[PDB]
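ARCHIVE RECORD
Type: protein–small molecule complex
Small molecule: protoporphyrin IX containing FE
Source of inputs: curated submission
Record status: active
Notes field left blank by submitter.
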Amino acid sequence: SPAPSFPQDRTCPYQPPKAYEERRGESPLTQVTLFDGRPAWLITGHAEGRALLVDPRLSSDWGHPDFPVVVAFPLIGVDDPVHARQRRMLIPSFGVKRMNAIRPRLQSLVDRLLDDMLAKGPGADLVSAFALPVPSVAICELLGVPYGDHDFFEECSRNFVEADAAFGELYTYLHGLVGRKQAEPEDGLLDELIARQLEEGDLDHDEVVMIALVLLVAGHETTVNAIALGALTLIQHPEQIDVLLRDPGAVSGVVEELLRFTSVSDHIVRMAKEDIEVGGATIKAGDAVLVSITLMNRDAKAYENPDIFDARRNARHHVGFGHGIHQCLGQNLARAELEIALGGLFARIPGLRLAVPLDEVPIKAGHDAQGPIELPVVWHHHH
Ligand code: HEM
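STRUCTURE (tokenized, with ligand):
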């Protein structure tokens, strides 16, 4: 593409910009241009994207001098062998048993947020009143943050999602927490990771803090958007709100279709390490490769009528959580947050509606995780 063309902003909060669907060819990948003129491949085919995302030839090394920027981090910003070591230290903390202990806390939090919303009502900004606190507290419970420090932690987290004093405040708190936990172990991912490091066996104090900070950054804003834009999508599709009021398996199916349709992480970034033949093209070593989660999830070859939101469709292999080497580690926590927050919101406020026309909802730009900056809602009944 001769002039910078990626990214482009959404105009509809839960549809990709026209220019992205126009950029899609018959081919499963096309080409765009980043802000400084760098060419990049855009992967749009659902099947080819999955194939490429398990492929070791695509790097995520953010420390490489030529790593693409669209305009430093454990896990998400490294290749093997650092990647596999950090991730295998974490996997056992995201187990079924830890999730299920997190569930009733998210339940109790969601009820409280809803009582409070209703006490102040109507309406509310659903981002501020509801989507914003949930991922915060989920991360506190995940990490094992002393319950005494939750308000502080949420507050920091909220200030973050300029703002690089929030991020530094979290660093310094976490740095101290890590030290306190090493000398007096408690319960939580921090403790587990500390014990896992020590196993091996010198503790890397800054790496533990950075991993904790990556978990927070990766898991906070995207989940906030997935809650808020998920609610927006349902408000705009009131003929399907009932699916949320049926059994837990229907709730989980709504959650999967929202992940696919809304594609809150819209693209992820890679760099080729070697030549790759894909889809009639030859990606060369050093080439920027953007993987479009949005256009993959709207690929008609994978999903019949892909631009329709259908809460009952089979959405099993969506890439809303990515795929392969770096696919979302916190995905089962996020699913829990979404099921409990969306199911609780519509159970309590099934007539929840927008207080503003759709086209007045402010939404994030194209380089960002996708979703509303604010979400003015009102209701005139609640259960
Ligand atoms: C609905 C909410 C979420 C969405 C849509 C989402 C989406 C994604 C996507 C698309 C990736 C792939 C990144 C890549 O391939 O470059 C990813 C990775 C990651 N996510 Fe999530 N995520 C969510 C929530 C969370 C939560 C709650 C956590 C933490 C508890 C988390 C932690 C991570 C981590 C650590 C990675 C990197 C894993 C690795 O590099 O091996 N995410 N996420």
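CURATOR ANNOTATION: The chain is about 45% helix and 10% strand.
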